[PDB]
Amino acid sequence: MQIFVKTLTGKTITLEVEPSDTIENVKAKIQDSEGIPPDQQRLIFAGKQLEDGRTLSDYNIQKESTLHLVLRLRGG
Numbered sequence: 001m002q003i004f005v006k007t008l009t010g011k012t013i014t015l016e017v018e019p020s021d022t023i024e025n026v027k028a029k030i031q032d033s034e035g036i037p038p039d040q041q042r043l044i045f046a047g048k049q050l051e052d053g054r055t056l057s058d059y060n061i062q063k064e065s066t067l068h069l070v071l072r073l074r075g076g
C-alpha cells in the first residue's frame with residue numbers, strides 16, 4: 001500500500017504504509033523525509049484533520065489515496 005502526501009506547494013511525498021499504521025507513524029515518516037516536526041504537521045483527508053492515535057483504516061484511507069499536508073496556522 002502506497003499513499004501520497006501532497007502539499008499545496010506542489011510537492012508530493014509517496015509513503016509505504018499499512019492500514020493499521022497510525023497517523024503518528026505517518027507524521028514520523030514525513031518528519032524523516034522533510035524535517036517538519038509532527039506537532040507542526042496538519043494532515044487532512046475526507047475534510048477531517050487526522051489525529052495521531054487513529055489508523056489509516058479508521059479514516060478509510062485507501063491504496064493510492066492522497067492526504068493533504070499543510071502547516072499548523074501560527075501567528076494569529
Ligand SMILES: [Ca+2]
Nearest residue numbers: 016017018021
Ligand atoms: Ca508500516
Ligand SMILES: [Cl-]
Nearest residue numbers: 062064065066
Ligand atoms: Cl481517496
